[PDB]
């Protein structure tokens, strides 16, 4: 791996961390849950299943 | 009975006493119970309309700050401060709200008016720390000098006030680089503080510990400025004065411990560590400083065990962990580390996300033998102000030298030619070199030592290009730094490495002998260990193997993990026909390569074949073919000759 | 059953658990409160409050990842009401972040004042938040360069419009769809995007 290939770990998240290239917000960003756990679906819940799922985690 | 409260308070009106508190209580009830900010605000505007006075307007300001409406809070603080200009507490609360609203010129000019009207002690700090946080350190300097332009007033309050103004002006002079003026201001504070103490002891004895502590802190700052002036003896003196003022302040104990360390008194350093640990057992710096002193005294088991105890008190502690990892590297006991990662993960499931964990993990993989995984974990840390700065230096080490070789070492740079003559290895390595310069552009320095180490490693990138003009420029920067600092080991290794690349090997040889005479230290340790290895290669070119073996063993005594120290020594044992001791060195090199060095794989199998250990030779010929399918030579020569002997 | 499910939803909230797991836990409780109300035919009176809190907290983070930062800001402003459920640190961090990304640096200043006031913080953390606030204030301003206006409802005196569970913004429609299960409103255009209620995941009707 090159330096550029490693830098992909930081490249996308920088747009949330940083404002106008002048400010860095990283201390606040510690509160964020990651996008793939924050995303939601147009899918239904039923109490027996929803309880079973929340109990299985 | 919330409505009984409200009806009673509503029955207090403009013509009655205590209506301010009654309407504040109505406001508070409506915000608590009805969740209604407008009923709160209208109760507070009723206070402003019926009972306009400086205290009610101050309280209205604070109410608007609790409501997060600082513009109306500033209108309230204005409605107060135009009526009672003598109140510094109101002028400071005004200042806070004006800062929260970018009205800095109003805050500054209100503090200047309060100071020109002779108001209380802390107003010099409010104005100075504001101007300092606005980076106007020069304006703070001139303000505090103007706040000290009077003939010094002999009142016990004014002596202490001017003493704090002098301390604060010295804190500003630190950022001005005016460190001699900081000492004179601190000595003038010490003079004032002696006049404070000689009255406080006779008329205010309950203040004695606080005023002694302020005298201790003055002496500590005089000592800090004398460290920056390289007068470490004044630093010991004025930290001893700081102890004579306060024997048990945590920072003063730790700083005189640092100076007893820096001026080579490990025993008095251990006294201050032991006293500091007796005063607070959870002081991490005292535990780690004591563990380093145990390590210097070769009590490595204690050094380890005290950091392990500190991690069993504090599992999430990336300083203590990274210190313990290097102790375990220098001991050759890396297998003990994973416990302490698991302890951090058990305490804190998010520890894996933290730059200090990522730095500690990146260090581990560089020592197990996985430079790509080390780079991946350092990269995840690399922007952090401590862990990322230290990760970046180790990314630069790998990006300069991913095989961890003696750069220009003739025992091995004449070999590897089947890859080293290829454009694939050349261009990918030189891209890593030319991008280590970008990792160096990410190492923003904060000290002259940081600028020097940065400039040296940029010139290590220039060396690693092997382009003659870049290597001559590197040699010139190294020789310039060595002319300014004749013991600067990273520059002396620079000179030697550049001279080797320039084929000026006799000029490299003496500049390495120069390093080899010096005592080791933990900061220059890697450049020491590299320099001894490069000098050992040059000694093998000279065939005087005894000085190479001494340098290789001295390297192992400071760091038992070094695979290159063993790999050179195994080659000497094979030259000496000691195929068994060569196989012992090659077994360590096989193991600590994580079986990724198939050239040592060949050598280990071949030395077992010659040692009449044919089964063990065939074991390793399988492990080489497992580690690398299609790896040349070994199958026919080692594996089939070992098989052919196996029943004769 | 609702009380015990709320006890889990409260502890799992206070642990800082996965926000969507905590939405699911308050929804399980709210559905049991609805089943107790069905059995009739102040925890007793406010069934969906924790489900709303975590739903709008997830929606503000979705709107931030969607780059829709002014909608993330409106949703994060609406979270001011739920400090009893979601700790103020998360609320005012996310509000300060969305306000800063929106260039609402006065609304960001409000969130930073609210953060520094917290008695649970160390002087170190108070200073770190002040350092970031002053960095923003010196580099741009401590005032709104672009202004949110949702505080016009959140002062409470004029009352409140219902916040849409599909968008985290107040419903300006005169009459509009409402979920037969949770009885929250949704904009008549935005509800067409869904098969299941964005809050309670019951089928739309």
Curated annotation (Swiss-Prot), chain A:
Disorder: Cranioectodermal dysplasia 3: A disorder primarily characterized by craniofacial, skeletal and ectodermal abnormalities. Clinical features include craniosynostosis, narrow rib cage, short limbs, brachydactyly, hypoplastic and widely spaced teeth, sparse hair, skin laxity and abnormal nails. Nephronophthisis leading to progressive renal failure, hepatic fibrosis, heart defects, and retinitis pigmentosa have also been described. Retinitis pigmentosa 81: A form of retinitis pigmentosa, a retinal dystrophy belonging to the group of pigmentary retinopathies. Retinitis pigmentosa is characterized by retinal pigment deposits visible on fundus examination and primary loss of rod photoreceptor cells followed by secondary loss of cone photoreceptors. Patients typically have night vision blindness and loss of midperipheral visual field. As their condition progresses, they lose their far peripheral visual field and eventually central vision as well. RP81 inheritance is autosomal recessive.
Cellular localization per UniProt: Cytoplasm, Cytoskeleton; Cell projection, Cilium
Similarity comment: family membership: Belongs to the IFT43 family.
Tagged with keyword Ribonucleoprotein: no
Stated role: As a component of IFT complex A (IFT-A), a complex required for retrograde ciliary transport and entry into cilia of G protein-coupled receptors (GPCRs), it is involved in ciliogenesis. Involved in retrograde ciliary transport along microtubules from the ciliary tip to the base.
Assembly: Component of the IFT complex A (IFT-A) complex. IFT-A complex is divided into a core subcomplex composed of IFT122:IFT140:WDR19 which is associated with TULP3 and a peripheral subcomplex composed of IFT43:WDR35:TTC21B. Interacts directy with IFT122, WDR35 and TTC21B.
Protein name: Intraflagellar transport protein 43 homolog
Gene name for this UniProt entry: IFT43
Swiss-Prot record, chain B:
Substitution effect: residue 271 to Q: Hypomorphic variant in vitro
Effect of residue 199 to C: In JBTS11; functionally null mutation in vitro
Effect ascribed to mutating residue 334 to V: Found in a patient with Meckel-Gruber like syndrome; uncertain significance; also found in patients with Bardet-Bied syndrome; uncertain significance; also found in a patient with nephronophthisis with extra-renal features; uncertain significance; hypomorphic variant in vitro
Entry's localization field: Cytoplasm, Cytoskeleton, Cilium axoneme
Result for mutant: residue 499 to C: In NPHP12; hypomorphic variant in vitro
TPR repeat residue numbers: 54-87, 89-121, 123-154, 163-196, 216-249, 251-283, 284-317, 355-388, 529-562, 564-596, 598-631
Disulfide bonds: none
Effect of residue 199 to H: Found in a patient with Meckel-Gruber syndrome also carrying a homozygous variant in CC2D2A; also found in a patient with short-rib thoracic dysplasia without polydactyly compoud heterozygous for causative mutations in IFT81; probably acts as a disease modifier; functionally null mutation in vitro
Outcome (variant: residue 540 to S): Found in a patient with Bardet-Biedl syndrome; probably acts as a disease modifier; the patients also carries two mutations in BBS1; functionally null mutation in vitro
Family: Belongs to the TTC21 family.
Record text on subunit structure and interactions: Component of the IFT complex A (IFT-A) complex. IFT-A complex is divided into a core subcomplex composed of IFT122:IFT140:WDR19 which is associated with TULP3 and a peripheral subcomplex composed of IFT43:WDR35:TTC21B. Interacts directy with WDR35 and TTC21B. Interacts with TTC25.
Role this protein plays: Component of the IFT complex A (IFT-A), a complex required for retrograde ciliary transport and entry into cilia of G protein-coupled receptors (GPCRs). Essential for retrograde trafficking of IFT-1, IFT-B and GPCRs. Negatively modulates the SHH signal transduction.
Protein name (database record): Tetratricopeptide repeat protein 21B
Range covered out of full length: 669 to 1316 of 1316
Swiss-Prot record, chain C:
Domain of life where this protein originates: Eukaryota
Subcellular location: Cytoplasm, Cytoskeleton, Microtubule organizing center, Centrosome; Cytoplasm, Cytoskeleton, Cilium axoneme; Cytoplasm, Cytoskeleton, Cilium basal body
Induction of expression: By TNF.
Disease tied to this entry: Cranioectodermal dysplasia 2: A disorder characterized by craniofacial, skeletal and ectodermal abnormalities. Clinical features include short stature, dolichocephaly, craniosynostosis, narrow thorax with pectus excavatum, short limbs, brachydactyly, joint laxity, narrow palpebral fissures, telecanthus with hypertelorism, low-set simple ears, everted lower lip, and short neck. Teeth abnormalities include widely spaced, hypoplastic and fused teeth. Short-rib thoracic dysplasia 7 with or without polydactyly: A form of short-rib thoracic dysplasia, a group of autosomal recessive ciliopathies that are characterized by a constricted thoracic cage, short ribs, shortened tubular bones, and a 'trident' appearance of the acetabular roof. Polydactyly is variably present. Non-skeletal involvement can include cleft lip/palate as well as anomalies of major organs such as the brain, eye, heart, kidneys, liver, pancreas, intestines, and genitalia.
Quaternary state and interactors: Component of the IFT complex A (IFT-A) complex. IFT-A complex is divided into a core subcomplex composed of IFT122:IFT140:WDR19 which is associated with TULP3 and a peripheral subcomplex composed of IFT43:WDR35:TTC21B. Interacts directy with IFT122, ITF43 and TTC21B. Interacts with IFT43. Interacts with CFAP61.
Protein name as it appears in the record: WD repeat-containing protein 35
Residues of the whole record sequence present: 946 to 1181 of 1181
